[PDB]
């Protein structure tokens, strides 16, 4: 059929072939043929997505009526819905197509269905020259996606220094918060982007708690980026108690996520030294409400002497890490029950099924008590059909 014929010709950029298929067709008829969806996409969306500049120019000369029509595009095996041509061209990095669509009057802030702008798509994949062209053509820096994530946030998350720098030079609001309270400083802390964090602080970005109660410092401790933790624990905006807790939580991350007991001890000793540095104002460990069977009824070490006999006792270290995480992150942070379950799984693998079951029981009780990453979802995600070699 002629519908799919012109579609496939647009998708492949075959200009002479396409003009042959429209020869001696009424203006009103070709405009109906170009405005036709095929596999959820228009001929213009395909020509723009694949960077066929002469095809994009030809189609728009015929009829500009689909220039804002969003449809289905594929990026690296993922399908994105309601994407207009400008967005797809920006996401794919086709600068000349970007310039051409804007010339024909494409709307610079027309988003996908998740409210991702063309500027967001360019920031995501790091297309600096497109980011600049969009901003020079009135793209709104502060239109965020449906989670409230901004262009500055995703640039920081992806470690795109030059783009982050340019957005800042053009006046991006450094203190925007996503729906869950994420700021661009958290994105730097979660990605370990220290140079970008320093750039944000040149604009006096404020360190704030996100929806999980996490500062950028704590986010770095949770994810294990020691470069961010080292920087921020020498930053005057973090108090002594915040520094001690961040170092102790980072140690727990070394135990459970990095499986690095020597590295954990280094940070626990650093924090313990700080707890006792002022002999007149000792920061002692807080005492929890009750001892916990799943933690083997352990309690946190409270002096430098109790730390010295710890490396030969890996089981004590694993219980310390659990005590520390529950103290600092709290029961309603998803990492707390996650790492309890992970520790239980390790005991199951070593044949300690009673320890395993008590840890899993505690994690489930914790999860159910704070309700307002299941075993089945973890299992299916793990063995999900990563069909390696099927293509080649």
From Swiss-Prot:
The first seven ANK repeats at the N-terminus (1-242) are essential for recognition of Lys/Arg-Xaa-Arg and -Lys/Arg-Xaa-Xaa-Arg C-degrons. ANK repeats lie at residues 1-30, 39-69, 81-110, 114-143, 147-176, 180-209, 212-241. It is linked to A dominant de novo FEM1C variant was identified in a patient with neurodevelopmental disorder with absent speech, pyramidal signs, and limb ataxia. Changing residue 125 to A: Reduced binding to C-degron with an arginine at the C-terminus. Abolished binding to C-degron with an arginine at the C-terminus. This is Protein fem-1 homolog C. Belongs to the fem-1 family. It comes from Homo sapiens. Changing residue 116 to A: Abolished binding to C-degron with an arginine at the C-terminus. The keyword Acetylation applies. The gene is FEM1C. TPR repeats lie at residues 244-278, 337-370. Substrate-recognition component of a Cul2-RING (CRL2) E3 ubiquitin-protein ligase complex of the DesCEND (destruction via C-end degrons) pathway, which recognizes a C-degron located at the extreme C terminus of target proteins, leading to their ubiquitination and degradation. The C-degron recognized by the DesCEND pathway is usually a motif of less than ten residues and can be present in full-length proteins, truncated proteins or proteolytically cleaved forms. Pathway: Protein modification; protein ubiquitination. The keyword Membrane does not apply. The chain holds residues 2 to 403 of 617 of the full protein. It comes from the Eukaryota. Changing residue 187 to K: Nearly abolished binding to C-degron with an arginine at the C-terminus. One of its GO terms (biological process) is ubiquitin-dependent protein catabolic process via the C-end degron rule pathway. Changing residue 120 to A: Reduced binding to C-degron with an arginine at the C-terminus. Changing residue 149 to N: Modifies specificity for C-degron at the C-terminus and promotes increased affinity for C-degrons usually recognized by FEM1B. Widely expressed. Highly expressed in kidney, cardiac tissue, skeletal muscle and testis. Expressed at lower levels in other tissues, including cartilage. Component of a Cul2-RING (CRL2) E3 ubiquitin-protein ligase complex, also named ECS (Elongin BC-CUL2/5-SOCS-box protein) complex, composed of CUL2, Elongin BC (ELOB and ELOC), RBX1 and substrate-specific adapter FEM1C. GO terms for cellular component: Cul2-RING ubiquitin ligase complex; cytosol; nucleoplasm; ubiquitin ligase complex. GO terms for molecular function: ubiquitin-like ligase-substrate adaptor activity. Keywords: Acetylation, ANK repeat, Disease variant, Repeat, TPR repeat, Ubl conjugation pathway. Changing residue 190 to K: Strongly reduced binding to C-degron with an arginine at the C-terminus.
């Amino acid at each position: 059929d002629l519908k799919t014929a012109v579609f496939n010709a647009a998708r492949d950029g075959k200009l002479r072939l396409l003009t042959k298929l429209l020869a001696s067709k009424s203006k009103e008829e070709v405009s109906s043929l170009i405005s036709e969806k095929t596999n959820g996409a228009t001929p213009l969306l395909m020509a723009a997505r694949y960077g066929h500049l002469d095809m994009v120019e030809f189609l728009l000369e015929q009829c500009s009526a689909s220039i804002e029509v969003g449809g289905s595009v594929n990026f690296d095996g993922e399908t994105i819905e309601g994407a207009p041509p400008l967005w797809a061209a920006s996401a794919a990095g086709h600068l000349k197509v970007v310039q051409s669509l804007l010339n024909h009057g494409a709307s610079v802030n027309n988003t996908t269905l998740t409210n991702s702008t063309p500027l967001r798509a360019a920031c995501f994949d790091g297309h600096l020259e497109i980011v600049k062209y969009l901003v020079e053509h009135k793209a709104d820096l502060e239109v965020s996606n449906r989670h409230g994530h901004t262009c500055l946030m995703i640039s920081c998350y992806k470690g795109h220094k030059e783009i982050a720098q340019y957005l800042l030079e053009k006046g991006a609001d450094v203190n925007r918060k996503s729906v869950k309270g994420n700021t661009a400083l958290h994105d730097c802390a979660e990605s370990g982007s220290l140079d970008i964090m320093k750039m944000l602080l040149m604009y006096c970005a404020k360190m704030e708690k996100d929806g999980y109660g996490m500062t950028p410092l704590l986010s770095a401790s949770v994810t294990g980026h020691t470069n961010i933790v080292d920087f921020l624990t020498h930053h005057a905006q973090t108090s002594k108690t915040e520094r001690i807790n961040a170092l102790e939580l980072l140690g727990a991350t070394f135990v459970d996520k990095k499986r690095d007991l020597l590295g954990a001890l280094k940070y626990w000793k650093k924090a313990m030294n700080m707890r006792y540095s002022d002999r007149t104002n000792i920061i002692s460990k807080p005492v929890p409400q009750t001892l916990i069977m799943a933690y083997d009824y352990a309690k946190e070490v409270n002096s430098a002497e109790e730390l010295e006999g710890l490396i030969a006792d890996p089981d004590e270290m694993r219980m310390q890490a659990l005590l520390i995480r529950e103290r600092i992150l709290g029961p309603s942070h998803p990492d707390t029950s996650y790492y309890i379950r992970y520790r239980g799984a390790v005991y199951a693998d070593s044949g300690n099924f009673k320890r395993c079951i008590n840890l899993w029981k505690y994690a489930l009780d914790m999860q159910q008590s704070n309700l307002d990453l299941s075993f089945a979802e973890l299992f299916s995600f793990m063995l999900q059909d990563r069909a390696k070699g099927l293509l080649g």
